[PDB]
Every structure is written in C-alpha cells, then in structure tokens.
Subunit: 72 residues, 2 copies
C-alpha cells in the first residue's frame, strides 16, 4: 500500500476500458476531501466495482459505450 | 402511483438536465428485470439521487458535463 492521495474513493487502479458483459453500470463523482480526485467506478454484474481512467481515450469510451447499450 | 414498467429502479421521473452545485455524481445502469429500462441517477450533494433522460440532448450534456468538472 503506497501513500497516495485517494483513500475515501474506492477506485481499484483505474483500468483502461475493460470489457463489459459483467459491467452493468458505472458511477462518476467529483473530487472534494483528501481523495481530491474524480470518481469513475463501473459496477460489475456480480455487484462489484472498478475504476477506469476517464482522462484515457479508450476509457472515455467506456463511459459513452456504457451510456449507449441499444437493442442491437 | 401509476402502473409503469420500472419499480426496481429508483429514478424520480428523469429530469431534463437540472443544475449541479448539489449534484456531485451520477450512476448509469442497463435494463434487465421488469424495470427493463436504463438507469441514470445523479447523486445529489446531500447524498440524494435523481434520474435524468440520457436520451434527452440537454441531459446527455448532464452526463458529459458531470464527466467534465475541470479546475476552471
């Protein structure tokens, strides 16, 4: 465990746009307390959560794609 | 209370992009059970939640703007 500026937050280690199938939702929150960092947790299908890098391009997709999800 | 196809979900009545200041985060989930509808809950600063219409244009902003939040 390294001394980073993010304790309150739950982010794993911001993945770079993983694959969904399990990923059923995501949460995005602004900074504030000592974590003073954004929030981008994708809730897994099993009811878990992961964080991804919205600053990342592929990951910025993760938001948009999670937002899409049409009938196909 | 009308008989709609969304009980499981918590959505208030999907607002059309309200103003933040309180809105500190949001959650987006896919359909599945009898709710069989998306999910777009903006968690309020007081720790509350609201739903908005991501299909809506202004509201699709609510996602992108909530995603932005820079130093300014």
């Amino acid at each position: 465990a390294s001394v980073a500026t993010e304790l309150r937050c739950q982010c794993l280690q911001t993945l770079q746009g993983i694959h969904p199938k399990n990923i059923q939702s995501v949460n995005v929150k602004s900074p504030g307390p000592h974590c003073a960092q954004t929030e981008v947790i994708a809730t897994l299908k099993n009811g878990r959560k992961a964080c991804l890098n919205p600053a990342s391009p592929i990951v910025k997709k993760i938001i948009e794609k999670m937002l899409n999800s049409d009938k196909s």
